[PDB]
Amino acid sequence: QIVQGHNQVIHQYFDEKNTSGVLVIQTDKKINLYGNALSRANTEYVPASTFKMLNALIGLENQKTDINEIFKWKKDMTLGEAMKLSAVPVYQELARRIGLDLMQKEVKRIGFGNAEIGQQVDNFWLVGPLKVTPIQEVEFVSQLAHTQLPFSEKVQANVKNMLLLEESNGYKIFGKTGWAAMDIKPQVGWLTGWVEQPDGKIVAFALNMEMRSEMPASIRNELLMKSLKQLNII
Ligand code: NA
Ligand code: NA
Ligand code: NA
Ligand code: NA
Ligand code: NA
Numbered sequence: 001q002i003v004q005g006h007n008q009v010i011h012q013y014f015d016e017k018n019t020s021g022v023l024v025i026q027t028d029k030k031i032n033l034y035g036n037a038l039s040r041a042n043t044e045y046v047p048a049s050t051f052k053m054l055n056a057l058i059g060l061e062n063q064k065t066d067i068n069e070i071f072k073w074k075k076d077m078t079l080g081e082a083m084k085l086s087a088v089p090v091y092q093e094l095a096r097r098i099g100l101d102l103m104q105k106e107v108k109r110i111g112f113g114n115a116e117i118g119q120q121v122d123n124f125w126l127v128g129p130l131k132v133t134p135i136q137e138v139e140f141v142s143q144l145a146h147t148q149l150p151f152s153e154k155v156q157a158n159v160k161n162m163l164l165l166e167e168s169n170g171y172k173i174f175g176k177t178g179w180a181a182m183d184i185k186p187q188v189g190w191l192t193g194w195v196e197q198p199d200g201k202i203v204a205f206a207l208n209m210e211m212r213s214e215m216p217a218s219i220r221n222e223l224l225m226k227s228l229k230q231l232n233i234i
Contacts, residue, residue, distance in 0.1 A: 002041070002135065005032030010227050012036075014209070017219065021209030023227050024138045031135065034227060040208050044114060044131035045188045048178030051125035052083055052091050053144065053159060055098075058106045060155045064097040067158050080162040083176070092122040109150065112140060127183045137192045138206035145174070145194040145202050163193065166221075170198035171234050177220060179211055187211035191220040195233055203233050 005025065011034070014021040020037035033041050056079060059065050070076050071090045082090035095103060100121040108115050113132025117124040124130045132140075143149045147156050163174040175193015189211040194204040207224050228234045 001026070001029060001031035003032055004038060005034050005231070007034045009230050010034040013223055013226055017209075017215075017223070019210045019212065021207065021223065022134055023224070024134045024206045024208075025231065025233070026138045026142050026204040031138065034231075035209075041135050042133050044133050045190075045208065046128050046180045046184060047113065047125050047130060047132050047137070048180040048188065048190060049086075049091075049125075050132075050137060050176050050178040050190045050192050051130070053141070053163070053176050054107070054110065054112055055091050055094055055125075056083065056159045056162065057144075057149065057151050057155055058098055058103065059094045060158060061151050062098065062102060062106075065094055080158075083162040084165075088126075095122045110140075112136070126180060134190075134192075134206040134208040137190070137208075138204050141175070141192050141194055141206065142202070142204040145196075145204060165193065169234070172196045173234075175205070177217070179217065181211065181213070187213070189215075189220050191224050195228065197233075205233075 014036035022033060022035040022038055022040040024041050025032050065079055067078060067080055070078060071093060077090060103121055104117045107117055113130060113136055116129040118129045144156060144160060147153055149156060160174060163176055165173045165175050173193060173195055175191055178190035180188045187210060189209045191207040194202050196202055207220055
């Protein structure tokens with residue numbers, strides 16, 4: 001922390017997509033950088049739907065919802081079902097219950113990115129003013145994985161359970177995508193999360209790249225999996 005890793009092959013993965021990207025990896029207390037645009041690692045970007053992790057923690061901690069509540073499609077969904085889908089009404093609904101005031105206090109207490117939420121409680125993560133670096137994101141998700149955020153242990157466990165993405169060969173991959181696509185240029189794509197390896201060890205990641213509208217949403221996962229293989233993390 002914080003050093004370029006062995007980055008030969010991974011830089012070429014990003015080059016092949018004709019876009020700039022970084023992958024930050026945090027093991028215990030040590031952070032390595034990979035990709036073709038390493039300066040992105042300490043550049044601030046809007047978090048986009050990666051903020052849903054923190055919205056859920058704040059909402060659950062403050063009893064503004066619970067994991068069994070059904071949000072009406074006015075499909076009907078729980079908070080957890082909505083985590084992995086596009087569900088801005090649901091997370092937007094939650095943000096309104098929290099309210100601008102409690103949201104700003106919580107974001108300040110956690111110290112997430114620039115910790116600015118402005119005056120519009122239901123879109124500050126999508127269009128600004130809140131911004132965060134990929135290094136900060138990996139640090140945040142590492143803390144969540146290890147139950148070290150200053151929230152209830154049970155709330156952290158319940159949000160972690162919402163983030164399982166894919167699993168294979170005894171490895172579990174947890175995380176959250178984001179894509180700030182509308183109202184923001186250049187577009188920014190996130191995939192932030194962690195690997196739990198078969199013996200229990202945790203390796204956290206934050207992928208951050210420039211997106212274009214013609215890209216498939218799976219490009220983030222594709223680049224992540226290739227890179228984690230190269231690094232022997234999976
Ligand atoms: Na941005
Ligand atoms: Na309900
Ligand atoms: Na949202
Ligand atoms: Na994929
Ligand atoms: Na491998």
